[PDB]
Design a protein around this ligand. Structure first.
Ligand SMILES: O=C1c2cc(-c3ccc(O)cc3)cc(Cc3ccccc3)c2C[C@@H]1Cc1ccc(O)cc1
Length: 189
């Protein structure tokens, strides 16, 4: 694995700058925690049929995750404060990884996969991953969705679970692990 940060890597900055511009759908140069939690909850409730119990769990997880990057309700976060807050989020997540503490990215996955998995067993199929990532907009083509199941160590079903995805997300969002490249296909650089 890799438990060292790489915040000076221009491709780490560019990866999250891509995400920031993807999240700033109204081209305001700034995004709020209200917008992020709305987008997240809108997906699982209105596209994926989450129950109120599932949605509340998922809401607290998304709220914590983006809140870990310094975003707050009623506050607009511009790009400089965004990437600065994302360094603090990656640092806190890397401390949790090292302490074998439940990370914010795992807690979001567990809450999300309970919705995305129709059997609610913490493992999603390729069609279910295409359903979520296209509703979220983070992936547009079915080709990029298939790259996820190539990069990830899929089980024998074969489905993707939170254990494997948390491992991939460690290297993709936090440490720039070369083996975690193309986790979202070509949709996210
Ligand atoms: O990990 C994930 C991630 C990271 C970012 C991101 C990335 C970098 C940024 O700088 C900003 C936003 C953005 C997204 C899309 C999204 C944004 C806001 C509201 C709902 C979805 C997603 C999904 C996906 C959910 C997930 C979580 C854990 C799992 O185990 C499996 C799936």
């Amino acid at each position: 694995g890799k438990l060292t940060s790489d915040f000076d890597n221009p491709r780490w900055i560019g990866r999250h700058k891509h995400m920031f511009n993807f999240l700033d759908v109204n081209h305001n140069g700034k995004i709020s925690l209200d917008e992020m939690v709305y987008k997240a909850s809108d997906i699982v409730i209105n596209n994926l049929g989450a129950t109120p119990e599932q949605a509340k769990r998922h809401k607290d997880a998304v709220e914590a995750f983006f809140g870990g990057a310094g975003m707050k309700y009623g506050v607009e976060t511009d790009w400089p404060a965004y990437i600065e807050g994302w360094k603090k989020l990656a640092t806190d997540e890397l401390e949790k990884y090292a302490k074998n503490e439940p990370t914010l990215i795992r807690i979001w996955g567990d809450a999300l996969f309970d919705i995305v998995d129709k059997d609610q067993n913490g493992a999603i199929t390729l069609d279910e991953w295409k359903a979520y990532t296209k509703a979220a907009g983070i992936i547009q083509s079915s080709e990029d969705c298939e790259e996820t199941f190539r990069v990830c160590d899929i089980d024998e079903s074969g489905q993707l679970d939170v254990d494997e995805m948390t491992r991939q997300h460690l290297g993709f969002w936090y440490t720039m692990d070369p083996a975690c490249e193309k986790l979202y296909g070509g949709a996210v650089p």
